[PDB]
Design a protein around this nucleic acid. Structure first.
Ligand SMILES: Nc1ccn([C@H]2C[C@H](O)[C@@H](COP(=O)(O)NP(=O)(O)OP(=O)(O)O)O2)c(=O)n1
Ligand SMILES: [Mg+2]
Ligand SMILES: [Mg+2]
Ligand code: NA
Ligand code: NA
Length: 326
DNA sequence: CCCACGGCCCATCACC
DNA sequence: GGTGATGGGC
DNA sequence: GTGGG
């Protein structure tokens, strides 16, 4: 974090544009510039120096010049003093409350943590849980604990069926010493791009994790994606662990590599790799990589036998998980 | 100067 | 109930 | 907010 001051500012600007302005491309623009600056190995001495990087234009250069001279940004000082912006920004930190619901709550006078707790009935299920574990969801997860959770999930899934393969992805797979949540990619031989030869493959895994009281809540649940809450078990007299967010994604087994590429991330790395794919004449999702015709309609899935194959198609030298933290 | 900005699962809602 | 848009999120 | 064509 040579330029922590700058990337903090841009991130705060990104969050403002997303939550308050509801201008999602300004949000992406700021997080993009913040990302490319974060890996810049020198201590930026000027906005013009920053402008040389792809993603940093004139406006951000100006803001960097102001920040380096005064240590702060007036655009942000103002935003920080607005009640509406502060209320809306706070509300969006509750899982299940997006920019729209946040602004709508404020119109009704519901703008504090106490307001949410007294008005539980005006929340849907996701928001109710997000409020419930608002404190825990602010806490990060030490890799030490991620290791415990990994072993539990993997052993529980082995117990359901020895042919399930569960892989922890996300920031954990990228080698982070701390994670915001747990991300699990799941495969089973019965579920391929060809056919689902067995119903409820994800349900049974969730069921099992619920019966050992690992999974405690459910935010959403379909045939391929689980979004919910989990908690490590504690020993006698030992104070309980915080509740953690957990994401489980069931992917067709023959499409494991695109799946594990996708959910390893990061989100910004994924954005960059797929944009580059489009430039190179391909399109990548969590299932396949396809060519673009002169048309703009995708062709057939190209053969993929590894993560490196995907990198190869678009003329990218392979980058290990720990070098994908953009 | 113009425009597109990665790709998609689940919950909810509007409409027929 | 089917379909499609929208919100929130990965 | 930024940048390729
Ligand atoms: N916008 C997004 C968000 C997530 N993802 C994929 C890549 C992420 O690594 C993976 C999990 O999302 P995530 O849990 O919100 N972020 P991630 O695990 O990378 O970092 P953490 O904050 O969880 O530690 O989903 C994506 O492709 N596009
Ligand atoms: Mg994660
Ligand atoms: Mg996640
Ligand atoms: Na630039
Ligand atoms: Na939220």
């Amino acid at each position: 974090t040579l330029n922590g001051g700058i990337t903090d500012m841009l991130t705060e600007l990104a969050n403002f544009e997303k939550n308050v302005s509801q201008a999602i491309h300004k949000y992406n623009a700021y997080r993009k510039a913040a990302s490319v600056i974060a890996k810049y190995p020198h201590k930026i001495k000027s906005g013009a120096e920053a402008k040389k990087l792809p993603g940093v234009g004139t406006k951000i250069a100006e803001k960097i010049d102001e920040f380096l001279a005064t240590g702060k940004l007036r655009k942000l000082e103002k935003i920080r003093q607005d009640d509406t912006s502060s209320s809306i920004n706070f509300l969006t930190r509750v899982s299940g409350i997006g920019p729209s619901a946040a602004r709508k709550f404020v119109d009704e006078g519901i703008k504090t943590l106490e307001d949410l707790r007294k008005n539980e009935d005006k929340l849907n299920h996701h928001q109710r849980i997000g409020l419930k574990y608002f404190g825990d969801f602010e806490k990060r997860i030490p890799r030490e604990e991620m290791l415990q959770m990994q072993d539990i999930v993997l052993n529980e899934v082995k117990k359901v069926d020895s042919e399930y393969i569960a892989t922890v992805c996300g920031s954990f797979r990228r080698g982070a010493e701390s994670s915001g949540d747990m991300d699990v990619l799941l495969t089973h031989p019965s579920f391929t791009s060809e056919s689902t030869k067995q119903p409820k493959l994800l349900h049974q895994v969730v069921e099992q994790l619920q019966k050992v009281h690992f999974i405690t809540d459910t935010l959403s649940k379909g045939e391929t994606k689980f979004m919910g809450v989990c908690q490590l078990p504690s020993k006698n007299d030992e104070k309980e662990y915080p509740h953690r967010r957990i994401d489980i994604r069931l992917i067709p087994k023959d499409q494991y590599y695109c799946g594990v590429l996708y959910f390893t991330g990061s989100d910004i790395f994924n954005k960059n790799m797929r944009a580059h794919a489009l430039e190179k004449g391909f399109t990548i999702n969590e299932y396949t990589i396809r060519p673009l015709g002169v048309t703009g309609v995708a062709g057939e899935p190209l053969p993929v036998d590894s993560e490196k194959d995907i990198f190869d198609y678009i003329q990218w030298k392979y980058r290990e998980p720990k070098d994908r933290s953009e």
